[PDB]
Amino acid sequence: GSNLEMRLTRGGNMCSGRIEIKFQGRWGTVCDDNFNIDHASVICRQLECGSAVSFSGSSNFGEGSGPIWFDDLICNGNESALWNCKHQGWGKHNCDHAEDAGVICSKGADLSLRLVDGVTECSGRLEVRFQGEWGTICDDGWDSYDAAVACKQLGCPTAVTAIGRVNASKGFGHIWLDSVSCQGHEPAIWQCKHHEWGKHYCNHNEDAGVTCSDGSDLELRLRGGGSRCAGTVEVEIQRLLGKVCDRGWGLKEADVVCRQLGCGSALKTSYQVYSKIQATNTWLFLSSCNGNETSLWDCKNWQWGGLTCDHYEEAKITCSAHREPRLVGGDIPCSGRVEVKHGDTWGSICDSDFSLEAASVLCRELQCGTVVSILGGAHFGEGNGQIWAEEFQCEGHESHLSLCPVAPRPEGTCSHSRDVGVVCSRYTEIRVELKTLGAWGSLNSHWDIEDAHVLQQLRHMFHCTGTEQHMGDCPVTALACAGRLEVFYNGAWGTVGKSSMSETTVGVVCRQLGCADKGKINPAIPMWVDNVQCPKGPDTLWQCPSSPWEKREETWITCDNKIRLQEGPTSCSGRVEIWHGGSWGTVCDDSWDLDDAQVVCQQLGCGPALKAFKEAEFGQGTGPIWLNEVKCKGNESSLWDCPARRWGHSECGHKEDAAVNCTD
Amino acid sequence: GSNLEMRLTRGGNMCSGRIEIKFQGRWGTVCDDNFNIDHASVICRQLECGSAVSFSGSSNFGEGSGPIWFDDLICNGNESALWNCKHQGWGKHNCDHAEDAGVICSKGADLSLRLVDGVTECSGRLEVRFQGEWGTICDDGWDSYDAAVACKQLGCPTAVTAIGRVNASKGFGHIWLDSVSCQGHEPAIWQCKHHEWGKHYCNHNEDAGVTCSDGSDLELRLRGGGSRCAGTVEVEIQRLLGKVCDRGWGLKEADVVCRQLGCGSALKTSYQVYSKIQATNTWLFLSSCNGNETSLWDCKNWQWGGLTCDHYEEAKITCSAHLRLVNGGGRCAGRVEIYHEGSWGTICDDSWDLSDAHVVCRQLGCGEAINATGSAHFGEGTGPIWLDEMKCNGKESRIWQCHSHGWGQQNCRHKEDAGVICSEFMSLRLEVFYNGAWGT
Amino acid sequence: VHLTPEEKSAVTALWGKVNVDEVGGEALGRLLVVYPWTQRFFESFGDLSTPDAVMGNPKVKAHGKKVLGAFSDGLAHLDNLKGTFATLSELHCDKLHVDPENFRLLGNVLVCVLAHHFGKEFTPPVQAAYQKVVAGVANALAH
Amino acid sequence: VLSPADKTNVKAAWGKVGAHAGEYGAEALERMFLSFPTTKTYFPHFDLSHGSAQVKGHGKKVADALTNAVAHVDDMPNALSALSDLHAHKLRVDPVNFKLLSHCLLVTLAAHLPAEFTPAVHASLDKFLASVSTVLTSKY
Amino acid sequence: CKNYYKLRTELPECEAVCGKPKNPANILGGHLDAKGSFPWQAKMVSHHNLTTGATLINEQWLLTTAKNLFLNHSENATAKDIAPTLTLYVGKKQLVEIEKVVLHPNYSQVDIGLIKLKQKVSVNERVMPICLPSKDYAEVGRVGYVSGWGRNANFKFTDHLKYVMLPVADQDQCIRHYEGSTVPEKKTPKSPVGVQPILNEHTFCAGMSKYQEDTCYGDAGSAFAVHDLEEDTWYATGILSFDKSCAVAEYGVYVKVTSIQDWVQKTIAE
Numbered sequence A: 001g002s003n004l005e006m007r008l009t010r011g012g013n014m015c016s017g018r019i020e021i022k023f024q025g026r027w028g029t030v031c032d033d034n035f036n037i038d039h040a041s042v043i044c045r046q047l048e049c050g051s052a053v054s055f056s057g058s059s060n061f062g063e064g065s066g067p068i069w070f071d072d073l074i075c076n077g078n079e080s081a082l083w084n085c086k087h088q089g090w091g092k093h094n095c096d097h098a099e100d101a102g103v104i105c106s107k108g109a110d111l112s113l114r115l116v117d118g119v120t121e122c123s124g125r126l127e128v129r130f131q132g133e134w135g136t137i138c139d140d141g142w143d144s145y146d147a148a149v150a151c152k153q154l155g156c157p158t159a160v161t162a163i164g165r166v167n168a169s170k171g172f173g174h175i176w177l178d179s180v181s182c183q184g185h186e187p188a189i190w191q192c193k194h195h196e197w198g199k200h201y202c203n204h205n206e207d208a209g210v211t212c213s214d215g216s217d218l219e220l221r222l223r224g225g226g227s228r229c230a231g232t233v234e235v236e237i238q239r240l241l242g243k244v245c246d247r248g249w250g251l252k253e254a255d256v257v258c259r260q261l262g263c264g265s266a267l268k269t270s271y272q273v274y275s276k277i278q279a280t281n282t283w284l285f286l287s288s289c290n291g292n293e294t295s296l297w298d299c300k301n302w303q304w305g306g307l308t309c310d311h312y313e314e315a316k317i318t319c320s321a322h323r324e325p326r327l328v329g330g331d332i333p334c335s336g337r338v339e340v341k342h343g344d345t346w347g348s349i350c351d352s353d354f355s356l357e358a359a360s361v362l363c364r365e366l367q368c369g370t371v372v373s374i375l376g377g378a379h380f381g382e383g384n385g386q387i388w389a390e391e392f393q394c395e396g397h398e399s400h401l402s403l404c405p406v407a408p409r410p411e412g413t414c415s416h417s418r419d420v421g422v423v424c425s426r427y428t429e430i431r432v433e434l435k436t437l438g439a440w441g442s443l444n445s446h447w448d449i450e451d452a453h454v455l456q457q458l459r460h461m462f463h464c465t466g467t468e469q470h471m472g473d474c475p476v477t478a479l480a481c482a483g484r485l486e487v488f489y490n491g492a493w494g495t496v497g498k499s500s501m502s503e504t505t506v507g508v509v510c511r512q513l514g515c516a517d518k519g520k521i522n523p524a525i526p527m528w529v530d531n532v533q534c535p536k537g538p539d540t541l542w543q544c545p546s547s548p549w550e551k552r553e554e555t556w557i558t559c560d561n562k563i564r565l566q567e568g569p570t571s572c573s574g575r576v577e578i579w580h581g582g583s584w585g586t587v588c589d590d591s592w593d594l595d596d597a598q599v600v601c602q603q604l605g606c607g608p609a610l611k612a613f614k615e616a617e618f619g620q621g622t623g624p625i626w627l628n629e630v631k632c633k634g635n636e637s638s639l640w641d642c643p644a645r646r647w648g649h650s651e652c653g654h655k656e657d658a659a660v661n662c663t664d
Numbered sequence B: 001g002s003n004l005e006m007r008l009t010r011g012g013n014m015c016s017g018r019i020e021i022k023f024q025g026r027w028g029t030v031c032d033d034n035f036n037i038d039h040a041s042v043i044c045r046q047l048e049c050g051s052a053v054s055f056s057g058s059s060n061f062g063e064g065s066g067p068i069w070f071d072d073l074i075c076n077g078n079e080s081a082l083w084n085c086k087h088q089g090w091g092k093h094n095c096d097h098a099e100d101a102g103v104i105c106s107k108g109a110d111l112s113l114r115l116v117d118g119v120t121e122c123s124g125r126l127e128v129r130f131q132g133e134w135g136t137i138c139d140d141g142w143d144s145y146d147a148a149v150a151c152k153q154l155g156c157p158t159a160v161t162a163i164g165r166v167n168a169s170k171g172f173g174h175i176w177l178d179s180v181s182c183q184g185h186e187p188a189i190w191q192c193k194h195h196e197w198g199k200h201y202c203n204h205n206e207d208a209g210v211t212c213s214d215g216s217d218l219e220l221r222l223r224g225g226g227s228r229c230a231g232t233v234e235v236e237i238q239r240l241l242g243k244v245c246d247r248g249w250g251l252k253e254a255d256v257v258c259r260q261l262g263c264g265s266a267l268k269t270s271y272q273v274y275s276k277i278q279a280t281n282t283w284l285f286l287s288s289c290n291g292n293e294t295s296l297w298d299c300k301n302w303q304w305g306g307l308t309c310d311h312y313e314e315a316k317i318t319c320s321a322h323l324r325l326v327n328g329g330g331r332c333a334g335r336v337e338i339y340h341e342g343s344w345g346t347i348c349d350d351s352w353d354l355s356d357a358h359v360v361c362r363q364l365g366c367g368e369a370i371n372a373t374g375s376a377h378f379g380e381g382t383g384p385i386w387l388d389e390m391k392c393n394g395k396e397s398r399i400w401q402c403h404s405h406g407w408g409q410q411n412c413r414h415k416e417d418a419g420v421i422c423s424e425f426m427s428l429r430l431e432v433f434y435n436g437a438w439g440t
Numbered sequence C: 001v002h003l004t005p006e007e008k009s010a011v012t013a014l015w016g017k018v019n020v021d022e023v024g025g026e027a028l029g030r031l032l033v034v035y036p037w038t039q040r041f042f043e044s045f046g047d048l049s050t051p052d053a054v055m056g057n058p059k060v061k062a063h064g065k066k067v068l069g070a071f072s073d074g075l076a077h078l079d080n081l082k083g084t085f086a087t088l089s090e091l092h093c094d095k096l097h098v099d100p101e102n103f104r105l106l107g108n109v110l111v112c113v114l115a116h117h118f119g120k121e122f123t124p125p126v127q128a129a130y131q132k133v134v135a136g137v138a139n140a141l142a143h
Numbered sequence D: 001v002l003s004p005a006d007k008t009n010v011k012a013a014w015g016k017v018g019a020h021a022g023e024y025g026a027e028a029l030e031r032m033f034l035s036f037p038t039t040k041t042y043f044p045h046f047d048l049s050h051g052s053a054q055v056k057g058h059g060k061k062v063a064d065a066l067t068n069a070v071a072h073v074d075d076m077p078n079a080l081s082a083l084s085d086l087h088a089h090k091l092r093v094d095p096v097n098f099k100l101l102s103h104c105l106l107v108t109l110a111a112h113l114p115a116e117f118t119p120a121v122h123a124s125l126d127k128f129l130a131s132v133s134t135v136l137t138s139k140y
Numbered sequence E: 001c002k003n004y005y006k007l008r009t010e011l012p013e014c015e016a017v018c019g020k021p022k023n024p025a026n027i028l029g030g031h032l033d034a035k036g037s038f039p040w041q042a043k044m045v046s047h048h049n050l051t052t053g054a055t056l057i058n059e060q061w062l063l064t065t066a067k068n069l070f071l072n073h074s075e076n077a078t079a080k081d082i083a084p085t086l087t088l089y090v091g092k093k094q095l096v097e098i099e100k101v102v103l104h105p106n107y108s109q110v111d112i113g114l115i116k117l118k119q120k121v122s123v124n125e126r127v128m129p130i131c132l133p134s135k136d137y138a139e140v141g142r143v144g145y146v147s148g149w150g151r152n153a154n155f156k157f158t159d160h161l162k163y164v165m166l167p168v169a170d171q172d173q174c175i176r177h178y179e180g181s182t183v184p185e186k187k188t189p190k191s192p193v194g195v196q197p198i199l200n201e202h203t204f205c206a207g208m209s210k211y212q213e214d215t216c217y218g219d220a221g222s223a224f225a226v227h228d229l230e231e232d233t234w235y236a237t238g239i240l241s242f243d244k245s246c247a248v249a250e251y252g253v254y255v256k257v258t259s260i261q262d263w264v265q266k267t268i269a270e
């Protein structure tokens, strides 16, 4: 050529705008057809304008005038000038004036990136300089890849690159970039695909930002719920305390948070409020979490600020370790002293604040079935540590103890001598070998395919139906109230052998007959069974292995009293306690007059009553409350004959446990 | 030139008729294009015939014959002659002889007003005479000021002026006047601002009327309600029966009616029927008025007749002249009830002693206390328990400032709501129970 | 059509709290801004290009006050709307040549202004009542 | 026509509408049904009473469509092509009903967002709703 | 013979007058036609009550768009059954019976159809044909007056006739606005309104006026009346074809009347 001159028109400065070439003394444009960054680089180098920041071809710099010179330029990048690639003619083009190609050159744009108004030198609102003036970046299409590119471009930690300005307000001035599409490896934010500079409809409320952190100053915790891992989510990112907006916050993100904190799964998107929390104007916005993420920081496109959580609440959560129970000190699997982990510390529970509903929730959560009994007074051993002063107000249907409403008390409840114990139903311990009496024996006399199917859980005659989850739910077969032991089998009655009759077997018999918890052996039809040995856990005699039925001086037993007086100077004075439903309960004081005291005193065995006490004179009792509002006539032989709101469903509390004072 | 003689032809007299100007030795008419009251006023002042009554462009005065000199004129009103506005050229026009414009001036006008089909000579359906033809007036924009202007123009006692024709049927012919706008000082009705004569957007059903009266023959009372100040509103105007329609009738006019009858204010727009009353063709329609007036006739723009209250109903009126202790069997005894979080709450009797009773009794001003009853002695309360363990020393003046367990922190039930029996509590059974002891 | 007494009461109660000096000017400015061809009739009111110029025009505010006074007059006579607006309809039809649709546009703009100032108080029932009111005003003021 | 400033204002206004869009659309439909009873003739199978679940769901759908149009404000004829064919052929909704619904949507936004319903934003939202109505009724 | 008429004879014949309105003037937007400044404008109503527009060109014929004549009709429908369907109103409300309607042979490329009345209409101040131009007034910058019986800003068919002063726009800009790049291999359906116009060498475009007011549904067929100040005569420069540009599409597409003048003359002479 050597006589052709070109210029860039309508681009703010001399190194940007439409491509215009002079030929035959006429200013003409260039098509966008087969136009890419190679042509822009060639043009920018030709004008001594540096490299090519970007190229545009839809006449974004306006529609030019004059004849289009080139249509399909094939430029590989290393050309001396634009009018040297092959193209397809000088003035031949199937183009319009809407296809004028425009370029933006390096020394004209003079691009640079910076972070403004953040909690750190690498966080806050992202601002880009274009043609000498600073402008923000619209957050449309702004995601973790863009944040990573920006963080690595500013040259500071890129371990975790969140999006959203931390606490910066809306920027002032232009908004240059929009819909930035980075792959995560571009040298700078403007080498990525994006909308043309300044072409968008974004307001300044949508300014994009980043949070460049080295995965070490991101902290998450739950505050206000009375435990380490139950309460409102409170994120601390680079010393800035904020919360999580509950928009698109379900059990998946909650489970992610719980796994991050190390408290198993998430049960509830709320909590029982124990303490207030500081108000924080910055929020964390989660787009979507898969649910298997080891941490919330590994979720996809979580904004740290930059939006308003006005019509949404703070993200609340209750992990399954708020009150995570366990049973220790029990020889059989599903029995033992109750120990509940209040977040991270294991501690026992007093027997005066653990109702049958709470024990049922405990047995259900621990996959232990239903509750058999509540054994107070540290039955399974003295627990070392602390005693939680929380009274569980369980309804009885909660999946976990964490969901139970809790009413803590300020004062100490009791010493470790009154640790509560709970015995659940599933005592099978089967792995085919089965463990009873402390011996690991091997169980096919009555082993069907349903028993094998149930053994789903992973000479006893299991009767599984193939549906129950655990072998404990399977009805197992292995075999007034003071006299000779008689057993009914094959349509005939017979005695029970006294050989190898331990105290556990007598207790099991008494509990099954529902008139005591223990018993004693006393001296004196054929004999059906002999050598009965009961393990701990079965409430019925027929779950005890023994010698086979041999139809051919016997077990005379006297069960203990159903009613006893506890915490008294003598055996005929103290808080009244009765036995029913498997566990020792108490009697409320509602209308507890002297007739009730007379009935109790004559049932214990000693003489007349003196004074019927009220409101837990001798202290709160163990187990549940069985009897309340007893209208004894003063002549009933036993307390069970008097009308009352018998056997549970009583609105009384353990602070109103009745008491009597009988003659010695 | 300045020697153009102008004449009006075939319009009754010299001041009314079709315009006709002599130029170039020939007489020519004028187009009606862009012809308004300004051109008519210019023509009238050219002949010294006064103001411009109206103008006609449909060649009603008669077909012309000659070179139409003017077609389009832009006259603002103040011109020394018709040949001074932007007449867009002389002789040039796009009319025919059927578009010739007439004009009627004040001096030659035979304008007149009359009342027809009314109870008296001062009321009825108003009518006006235009071009020797008697026509009616539409009632749109016909307010009390127009009524007063018409009454003054006709000439008879005009102390009270009321719009609305009395019992008058629809008129016949033309509606020569419409949308009259008078300020009340015009000598006649045509000096007011209104629409062009003959041009209207009404029908003869909306024929405007007037009721000129001195206020001595206007009577109102309530009939059918037995008492004088309850029942439907019956109207007597110029010895004519009538009833008030409820269109635009609220309590504000109802209390005006009640004050006029002298029975206090208004209570409701309904009454209990006592006797049957006849139905009158004419009605009283009240547009609106403030409500502080001393009489119904004294508030602005009330229409008497002239419309049918068929879509609406008759207007009726009936004038005005047609901490705590709960369940205690007394004032200073009962369950101690406290208020918190916008709900009444109770206090559990846990560790409730006579010190707490003294505190709650002195807070309520009931002196000291005799008893501290528990187990819901005065019935179980219905409200969440706020305080559980009260540790008052028996000296403070308030109960909530004690060493309780906090609001909402309790382990009790409503079956043991605390109650007190203060010394000031008194019961009667003759024996009086004061200071916790019975006596004569 | 006749307006129900409950609708009349709601309309009157909502109009009692209407700032007469500002609501009409707001409605007129919003009309001139949203529908620019309505600025043709107000070429004597000064600058009317920028929306801020239209809303801040003192002449527009005064004329909006007059318009809202006319709406109040028509509200006091909701049952007789043609009679009270006959002179205004004649003025707009002859002296100004205002298209009747501009009246409905201003009515809808006024409804939006009322909603804007009254928030949730402008319930769908009172909006329907005011829609009937403005439709009646436009019909009485047209042709 | 939607100027770039008008498109910016519409985008900002609908962004600050945000999650309340479904019940905004339900309220707009309710206001259209009450204020303009002639629009109820296109929903003979709907429960048109206040607080209806079906009307609330349809308002949610309408607001979702408007949000899609706002996101594709530069390509509205393509974003609303299916809705255009629907409203123009299957339902044959007269465009005057579209203008009534646009007015009711404007009333809803004014009642719920008074601080942000500036005359410029109100004009921009009216232009956007007119564009949506013209796109939907183009094939009518 | 009387006014609004001229004598066409060197016994004689008295015909109407080319577009000389009694009171000449000086649709979303305003400009209410209070003085009846557009006598040539006619209101065409289909069977299913969609008001449209048609323009008087002589005492007996009217120019409209084939898309207007095909409303509530099948795409295969002929011109014989279209005529009984249409109802035509000229003047205030003067119903005029349609003897026959003849479509353009290339009605898919030139959106024009002719309407012939049963009897010649009585020309007066409210009914008067517009004159087909002898020149090309569609040169860019010319401001023509577009009357209209179509919809208004509320999409309700306007009760009163309205008009707008729409200046013709650059053709390349109009195709670029509707099609892609004025070249056949790069044209795309880029209309801001769903439907796309019939843009070719026989049609020009006129943008919105200075108040962003344009033509909406029902304005099709209305003449792009151009006031020739030299001879004070009104010429139908174009017949509005793409009325769907209410306010979204910046340009309304008007088919040039000069391109169809030969065909309309051959028709107006059977």
Ligand code: HEM
Residues within 6 Å of the ligand: C038, C041, C042, C063, C066, C067, C070, C071, C088, C092, C096, C098, C102, C103, C104, C106, C107, C137, C138, C141
């Ligand atoms: C919709 C209800 C409307 C009402 C109740 C109303 C009321 C009024 C009032 C009270 C006046 C004053 C008359 C005078 O000063 O003599 C007036 C005049 C006027 N109106 Fe309206 N108006 C309405 C709508 C409109 C609209 C929509 C427009 C234009 C698009 C408009 C344009 C005008 C103009 C230009 C004037 C004369 C202003 C002047 O002379 O300075 N009006 N109208």
Ligand code: HEM
Residues within 6 Å of the ligand: D039, D040, D042, D043, D058, D061, D062, D063, D065, D066, D083, D086, D087, D091, D093, D097, D098, D099, D101, D102, D132, D133, D136
């Ligand atoms: C901005 C204006 C409008 C928008 C964005 C809009 C949007 C929608 C959407 C998203 C649907 C759902 C289509 C589907 O689920 O398949 C729909 C359906 C429908 N629309 Fe609209 N619409 C608008 C205006 C209107 C108006 C004004 C009416 C009637 C007065 C109307 C009548 C209907 C009907 C009858 C349906 C069918 C609903 C059904 O069958 O359950 N649309 N529209």
Ligand SMILES: *[C@@H]1O[C@H](CO)[C@@H](O[C@@H]2O[C@H](CO)[C@@H](O)[C@H](O)[C@H]2NC(C)=O)[C@H](O)[C@H]1NC(C)=O
Residues within 6 Å of the ligand: A117, A118, A119, A120, A167, A168, A169
């Ligand atoms: C966002 O938060 C940061 C950190 O709290 C703010 O930066 C501090 O601003 C105060 C001014 O009150 C200075 O005294 C500190 O030195 C700043 N700290 C740092 C690390 O820069 C920042 O101003 C906040 N931006 C807002 C509120 O828009």
Ligand SMILES: *[C@@H]1O[C@H](CO)[C@@H](O[C@@H]2O[C@H](CO)[C@@H](O)[C@H](O)[C@H]2NC(C)=O)[C@H](O)[C@H]1NC(C)=O
Residues within 6 Å of the ligand: E047, E048, E072, E073, E074
């Ligand atoms: C012309 O318009 C009429 C009336 O709108 C259409 O008749 C209706 O057609 C639809 C669809 O077939 C029916 O559901 C209605 O019941 C018809 N209404 C009637 C007959 O009164 C007619 O289909 C239209 N012609 C077309 C679309 O070609």
Ligand SMILES: *[C@@H]1O[C@H](CO)[C@@H](O)[C@H](O)[C@H]1NC(C)=O
Residues within 6 Å of the ligand: A290, A292, A293, A294
């Ligand atoms: C989580 O699951 C998704 C698919 O649901 C999978 O793509 C991803 O790799 C998983 N991540 C981990 C850490 O297991």
Ligand SMILES: *[C@@H]1O[C@H](CO)[C@@H](O)[C@H](O)[C@H]1NC(C)=O
Residues within 6 Å of the ligand: A568, A569, A573, A574, A610, A661, A662
């Ligand atoms: C029971 O009564 C006797 C006699 O009144 C008394 O001595 C004894 O202390 C009482 N029991 C208790 C526990 O106080």
Ligand SMILES: *[C@@H]1O[C@H](CO)[C@@H](O)[C@H](O)[C@H]1NC(C)=O
Residues within 6 Å of the ligand: B117, B118, B119, B120, B166, B167, B168, B169
């Ligand atoms: C109105 O009443 C007067 C007086 O009673 C009577 O002369 C006149 O005929 C009546 N007009 C009617 C009934 O139209």
Ligand SMILES: *[C@@H]1O[C@H](CO)[C@@H](O)[C@H](O)[C@H]1NC(C)=O
Residues within 6 Å of the ligand: B290, B292, B293, B294
């Ligand atoms: C009624 O109140 C108005 C105030 O608008 C006042 O002008 C008028 O004088 C009052 N009338 C009486 C009788 O008090």
Ligand SMILES: *[C@@H]1O[C@H](CO)[C@@H](O)[C@H](O)[C@H]1NC(C)=O
Residues within 6 Å of the ligand: B370, B371, B372, B373
């Ligand atoms: C109140 O106290 C006195 C004496 O302490 C007692 O005689 C009386 O029965 C008590 N009454 C109640 C209702 O507690």
Ligand SMILES: *[C@@H]1O[C@H](CO)[C@@H](O)[C@H](O)[C@H]1NC(C)=O
Residues within 6 Å of the ligand: E047, E048, E049
């Ligand atoms: C069109 O409107 C007329 C009334 O002008 C009516 O009689 C006719 O039934 C309508 N036709 C349709 C298809 O709606």
Ligand SMILES: *[C@@H]1O[C@H](CO)[C@@H](O)[C@H](O)[C@H]1NC(C)=O
Residues within 6 Å of the ligand: E105, E106, E263
């Ligand atoms: C229709 O188009 C053809 C060529 O495409 C042309 O020859 C013919 O003249 C056109 N029709 C008319 C009436 O001009």
Ligand SMILES: [Ca+2]
Residues within 6 Å of the ligand: A032, A033, A099
């Ligand atoms: Ca290209």
Ligand SMILES: [Ca+2]
Residues within 6 Å of the ligand: A033, A071, A072, A094, A095
């Ligand atoms: Ca090419």
Ligand SMILES: [Ca+2]
Residues within 6 Å of the ligand: A139, A140, A206
């Ligand atoms: Ca965004």
Ligand SMILES: [Ca+2]
Residues within 6 Å of the ligand: A446, A447, A448, A451, A461, A462, A463, A464
């Ligand atoms: Ca088995």
Ligand SMILES: [Ca+2]
Residues within 6 Å of the ligand: A588, A589, A590, A591, A652, A656
């Ligand atoms: Ca008790």
